[PDB]
Design a protein around this ligand. Sequence first.
Ligand code: 6DX
Ligand code: CLR
Ligand code: CLR
Ligand code: CLR
Ligand code: CLR
Ligand code: OLB
Ligand code: OLA
Ligand code: OLA
Ligand code: NA
Length: 388
Amino acid sequence: GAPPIMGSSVYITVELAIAVLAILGNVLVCWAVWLNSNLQNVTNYFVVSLAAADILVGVLAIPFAITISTGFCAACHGCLFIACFVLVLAQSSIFSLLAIAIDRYIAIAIPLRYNGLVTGTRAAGIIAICWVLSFAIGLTPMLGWNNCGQPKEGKAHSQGCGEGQVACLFEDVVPMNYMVYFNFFACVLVPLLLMLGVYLRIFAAARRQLADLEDNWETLNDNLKVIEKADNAAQVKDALTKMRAAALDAQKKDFRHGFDILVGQIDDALKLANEGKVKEAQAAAEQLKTTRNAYIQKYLERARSTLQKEVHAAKSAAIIAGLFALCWLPLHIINCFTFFCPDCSHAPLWLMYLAIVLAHTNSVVNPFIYAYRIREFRQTFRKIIRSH
Ligand SMILES: Nc1nc(NCCCN2CCN(c3ccccc3)CC2)nc2nc(-c3ccco3)nn12
Ligand SMILES: CC(C)CCC[C@@H](C)[C@H]1CC[C@H]2[C@@H]3CC=C4C[C@@H](O)CC[C@]4(C)[C@H]3CC[C@]12C
Ligand SMILES: CC(C)CCC[C@@H](C)[C@H]1CC[C@H]2[C@@H]3CC=C4C[C@@H](O)CC[C@]4(C)[C@H]3CC[C@]12C
Ligand SMILES: CC(C)CCC[C@@H](C)[C@H]1CC[C@H]2[C@@H]3CC=C4C[C@@H](O)CC[C@]4(C)[C@H]3CC[C@]12C
Ligand SMILES: CC(C)CCC[C@@H](C)[C@H]1CC[C@H]2[C@@H]3CC=C4C[C@@H](O)CC[C@]4(C)[C@H]3CC[C@]12C
Ligand SMILES: CCCCCCCC/C=C/CCCCCCCC(=O)OC[C@@H](O)CO
Ligand SMILES: CCCCCCCC/C=C\CCCCCCCC(=O)O
Ligand SMILES: CCCCCCCC/C=C\CCCCCCCC(=O)O
Ligand code: NA
């Protein structure tokens, strides 16, 4: 039985190193959004709320974690607060991650009404509501779902605790059924599975919209060939009607002028076709190639470029949500083994604190993901660092 202070010193030192990195990195995130108006959108307001939660992990949750690892004597309800405040920050992170995913689905599924529906004022109201709900969820043990009514009196007496005090240990005061059923299953696992469903819908919507862009482009060029090798006016008419319906379908200033020319030129050739002038209709339809090269192809390439940037931005946000799951799941899974298998030996002490440190490391990783995957953040980070 090596002296407890030795293994404790390693744990505390690692925790302090994580606290400094979580504060520095996420302060840089908040500083960047404050300074750059190009980073000031609804999506990044939830990013800032997520960074504030990670800042508080280093300022409060990690000092709280170091304190409870000592098992110090404390009034049980004060011990409860130290033990549960990290659950508030974790729940806030979940709400921010879910809001980011929903925000990106709205942008890709209904971009015409995104700016009218998703505003900064409504976003700030959602952020406040989610923080209130995070305190209620994370501090639910302080409402009565705790073990303070059944204190470990032998442990308190051996540590010399005073009357009404307990040895402040996490699994002594926080019920494991709350941690597994309420916190993990209901409040962590279900929202993460919802985020998964949202991102699946995002990428499915992106793939469908890109295919529709390419299908209208192919339909335009195929029907042009049909008109060129038609032998009667009725065949030219058939191809032109399909081109006109697709042109209006692809339309839903230089963008508008290009489609205004295209639809008008289609109506010109259609009128010649209805008069039975095949050669004259085919020559009029040949003018469409000038409009296609000068206007339509540029919109196709820009619409494609915008969708691919939305896919890339959604992938970056999904990586953030996935890294949250990877960092928090081991600790939750260990609680499941403790709760569901009382015949299994408890996970060893070194593995408990490895899982605790790993969960805390999640508060360090998000600034690196933004810096490596988002150019606007990376450039703003460099300006802040260089100029300071
Ligand atoms: N489960 C849990 N524990 C702690 N801290 C106490 C660890 C040391 N114990 C010391 C006494 N035991 C022990 C006894 C013999 C051998 C090994 C261990 C249990 C662990 N902190 C937490 N945080 C979240 C958590 C937060 C969010 C999701 O899960 N679970 N958790
Ligand atoms: C704005 C920020 C900096 C304020 C932070 C306040 C924190 C540090 C305070 C608020 C409530 C406090 C707890 C209230 C009750 C108890 C029970 C006592 O038997 C031991 C200390 C303990 C567990 C306190 C520890 C410190 C504590 C968590
Ligand atoms: C900005 C918002 C979250 C305000 C923060 C205030 C919180 C952190 C403070 C304010 C008053 C504090 C409480 C005051 C008294 C007690 C009684 C003690 O037996 C257990 C701790 C407990 C329950 C404290 C826990 C922390 C506490 C709830
Ligand atoms: C989230 C991804 C990376 C999966 C992580 C799997 C981890 C959390 C799993 C894999 C194997 C598991 C261990 C396998 C066996 C035992 C022995 C039992 O007496 C207590 C739990 C304990 C010690 C498990 C704890 C959790 C564990 C370490
Ligand atoms: C997000 C995805 C990975 C789903 C989460 C999977 C979790 C809920 C699964 C993975 C492995 C599972 C554990 C595997 C083995 C045992 C031992 C058994 O005696 C009691 C249940 C218990 C402890 C399981 C509980 C649930 C469990 C922890
Ligand atoms: C123990 C005490 C600890 C205190 C806990 C504090 C928890 C609450 C913290 C919340 C941080 C929220 C910051 C999030 C800020 C988001 C940006 C915003 O909302 O403004 C943009 C829009 O307004 C545009 O119109
Ligand atoms: C930027 C503000 C950050 C706050 C710095 C606080 C750092 C100190 C970390 C942990 C303090 C833990 C004290 C341990 C409890 C006493 C031990 C015992 O009573 O047995
Ligand atoms: C963990 C317990 C959860 C508590 C369940 C019910 C509490 C929250 C209820 C409603 C939140 C909705 C807030 C709506 C505010 C109105 C905004 C407006 O005026 O436009
Ligand atoms: Na977090």
